Amino acid sequence: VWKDADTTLFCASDAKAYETEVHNVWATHACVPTDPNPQEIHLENVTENFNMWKNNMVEQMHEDIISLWDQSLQPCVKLTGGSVIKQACPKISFDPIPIHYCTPAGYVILKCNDKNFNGTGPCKNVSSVQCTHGIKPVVSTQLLLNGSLAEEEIIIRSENLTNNAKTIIVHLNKSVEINCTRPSNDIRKAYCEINGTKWNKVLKQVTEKLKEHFNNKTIIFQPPSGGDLEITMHTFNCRGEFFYCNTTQLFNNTCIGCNGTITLPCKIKQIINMWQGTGQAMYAPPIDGKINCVSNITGILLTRDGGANNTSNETFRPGGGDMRDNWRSELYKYKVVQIE
Ligand SMILES: CN1CCN(C(=O)N2CCC[C@H](C(=O)Nc3ccc(Cl)c(F)c3)C2)CC1
Ligand SMILES: *[C@@H]1O[C@H](CO)[C@@H](O)[C@H](O)[C@H]1NC(C)=O
Numbered sequence: 001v002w003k004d005a006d007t008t009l010f011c012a013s014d015a016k017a018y019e020t021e022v023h024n025v026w027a028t029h030a031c032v033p034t035d036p037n038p039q040e041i042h043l044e045n046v047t048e049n050f051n052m053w054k055n056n057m058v059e060q061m062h063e064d065i066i067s068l069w070d071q072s073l074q075p076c077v078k079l080t081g082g083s084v085i086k087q088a089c090p091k092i093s094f095d096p097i098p099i100h101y102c103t104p105a106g107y108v109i110l111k112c113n114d115k116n117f118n119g120t121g122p123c124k125n126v127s128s129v130q131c132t133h134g135i136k137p138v139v140s141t142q143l144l145l146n147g148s149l150a151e152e153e154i155i156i157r158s159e160n161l162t163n164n165a166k167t168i169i170v171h172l173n174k175s176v177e178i179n180c181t182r183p184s185n186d187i188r189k190a191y192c193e194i195n196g197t198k199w200n201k202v203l204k205q206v207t208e209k210l211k212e213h214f215n216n217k218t219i220i221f222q223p224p225s226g227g228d229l230e231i232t233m234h235t236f237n238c239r240g241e242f243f244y245c246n247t248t249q250l251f252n253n254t255c256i257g258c259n260g261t262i263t264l265p266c267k268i269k270q271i272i273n274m275w276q277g278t279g280q281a282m283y284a285p286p287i288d289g290k291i292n293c294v295s296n297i298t299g300i301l302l303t304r305d306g307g308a309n310n311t312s313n314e315t316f317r318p319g320g321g322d323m324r325d326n327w328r329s330e331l332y333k334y335k336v337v338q339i340e
């Protein structure tokens with residue numbers, strides 16, 4: 001017996017001692033070691049309701065990642081609303097590791113094992129756990145990288161598909177590799193390579209799944225309509241450097257003579273509109289040498305256009321900005337309950 005409840009969670013890592021990587025340091029002092037014997041209990045003939053868009057676990061992970069970045073990626077200057085906070089900005093080692101989220105004594109986490117679960121409503125194959133799985137806290141926009149995959153069909157996640165202000169999260173069932181490099185000695189010029197055949201097959205599957213959700217209206221893809229740069233381009237952190245990569249060849253190279261390698265131009269930016277809170281951070285120029293990260297695109301952040309009620313189309317643009325949807329894309333299958 002149990003009921004929905006919220007409590008202070010704790011985290012669990014496989015952080016290594018002596019390793020200077022920032023996630024390792026943070027998790028070494030802020031998390032416990034992984035449960036070496038983690039036990040799950042299937043609950044026979046139990047249906048439990050979940051809401052991924054209203055889940056306090058999301059906000060707690062968010063607060064954790066804010067604190068991590070606050071202690072690790074210190075910008076040279078931070079213009080944080082009139083304030084000019086100055087400090088050192090040594091180049092650090094940066095590579096996210098999996099974090100587990102665990103309930104204290106008296107509470108438990110319920111986890112949905114429905115292979116079709118969209119994050120909202122009833123779940124029929126429920127199990128009980130003490131900790132989530134290892135979730136890498138990957139900050140990104142437009143594309144979710146290095147996450148899990150849907151176990152069968154592509155899942156569409158939204159708090160309300162008919163409300164165009166509510167973000168759509170696409171959960172892919174087959175990752176697509178994005179391979180990004182800034183070559184060794186424009187020091188801020190970089191680029192990302194993606195397989196065109198794989199990308200366009202995945203995007204065609206995505207449009208047809210979307211067609212299932214919008215009475216077979218024609219699904220159109222377009223790039224963002226205004227933003228700060230962090231939203232209009234695919235923005236991520238690779239080895240401590242902030243990459244901004246133009247993706248109109250992803251959402252506007254129709255191919256729905258193009259089955260080859262897509263190259264997206266990129267810039268490493270020093271001034272950044274932060275995601276942790278409104279304000280500006282200025283870091284230092286990129287490190288010397290080859291800067292490379294090979295990531296899996298495992299989900300997409302989308303926003304549907306409004307005012308197409310009286311049209312036969314629905315146009316979607318890549319989105320992002322609020323990283324709680326990033327954590328939501330992995331925490332969707334979890335919810336905390338107080339055990340009575
Ligand atoms: C709610 N809360 C308020 C303040 N916020 C904001 O004002 N934003 C507007 C400008 C862009 C912001 C962003 O996403 N920055 C970013 C920076 C680095 C990386 Cl690697 C990245 F992937 C993304 C979103 C955040 C949301
Ligand atoms: C429900 O999910 C659990 C967890 O993996 C597993 O036993 C199986 O996939 C499902 N059980 C049944 C009886 O289908």
Ligand SMILES: *[C@@H]1O[C@H](CO)[C@@H](O)[C@H](O)[C@H]1NC(C)=O
Nearest residue numbers: 146147149174175294295296
């Ligand atoms: C990328 O995807 C492949 C296949 O889906 C998977 O085996 C691999 O673990 C993924 N890479 C990372 C870094 O998660």
Ligand SMILES: *[C@@H]1O[C@H](CO)[C@@H](O)[C@H](O)[C@H]1NC(C)=O
Nearest residue numbers: 152153154173174205206209
């Ligand atoms: C992914 O899901 C789609 C459904 O939209 C399905 O047609 C496709 O076969 C799936 N791909 C894989 C690799 O399972």
Ligand SMILES: *[C@@H]1O[C@H](CO)[C@@H](O)[C@H](O)[C@H]1NC(C)=O
Nearest residue numbers: 118120121122156157158161
């Ligand atoms: C998710 O599934 C529930 C129950 O099947 C349904 O009510 C809800 O509309 C679905 N959400 C989406 C976005 O498809």
Ligand SMILES: *[C@@H]1O[C@H](CO)[C@@H](O)[C@H](O)[C@H]1NC(C)=O
Nearest residue numbers: 159160161162163164165166
């Ligand atoms: C979803 O959005 C539509 C459009 O604004 C609204 O009519 C509907 O009430 C919303 N659903 C819920 C559950 O609030």
Ligand SMILES: *[C@@H]1O[C@H](CO)[C@@H](O)[C@H](O)[C@H]1NC(C)=O
Nearest residue numbers: 178179180181193292293294
């Ligand atoms: C990624 O891109 C670089 C530069 O084109 C290339 O050397 C490398 O082989 C590519 N693939 C991987 C897996 O790094």
Ligand SMILES: *[C@@H]1O[C@H](CO)[C@@H](O)[C@H](O)[C@H]1NC(C)=O
Nearest residue numbers: 195196197198201259260261
């Ligand atoms: C992209 O994936 C397809 C299979 O979907 C494969 O035939 C092709 O070789 C891949 N691209 C490259 C550059 O190898």
Ligand SMILES: *[C@@H]1O[C@H](CO)[C@@H](O)[C@H](O)[C@H]1NC(C)=O
Nearest residue numbers: 208211212213214215216217
């Ligand atoms: C969508 O189109 C398919 C064609 O494969 C058709 O069978 C189905 O009835 C249509 N459904 C809606 C909701 O438009």
Ligand SMILES: *[C@@H]1O[C@H](CO)[C@@H](O)[C@H](O)[C@H]1NC(C)=O
Nearest residue numbers: 223229232233246247248249
């Ligand atoms: C991305 O590149 C295209 C040219 O291919 C350009 O029209 C567009 O303005 C670029 N995006 C941004 C945000 O500048």
Ligand SMILES: *[C@@H]1O[C@H](CO)[C@@H](O)[C@H](O)[C@H]1NC(C)=O
Nearest residue numbers: 222223224248251252253254
């Ligand atoms: C892509 O959309 C942009 C608007 O951001 C526009 O500049 C361009 O014409 C479109 N691409 C193609 C290939 O038409």
Ligand SMILES: *[C@@H]1O[C@H](CO)[C@@H](O)[C@H](O)[C@H]1NC(C)=O
Nearest residue numbers: 145146236237238293294295
């Ligand atoms: C994604 O995971 C790979 C494998 O560990 C890593 O090399 C890459 O840097 C990661 N990408 C990001 C953006 O963290």
Ligand SMILES: *[C@@H]1O[C@H](CO)[C@@H](O)[C@H](O)[C@H]1NC(C)=O
Nearest residue numbers: 162163164306307308309310
């Ligand atoms: C568009 O239609 C949906 C329901 O089909 C409704 O909830 C929404 O308010 C409408 N928007 C406008 C601007 O008429």
Ligand SMILES: [Cl-]
Nearest residue numbers: 032033034035
């Ligand atoms: Cl423990």
Ligand SMILES: [Cl-]
Nearest residue numbers: 010103104105
């Ligand atoms: Cl404890």
Ligand SMILES: [Cl-]
Nearest residue numbers: 227228229232
């Ligand atoms: Cl933007």
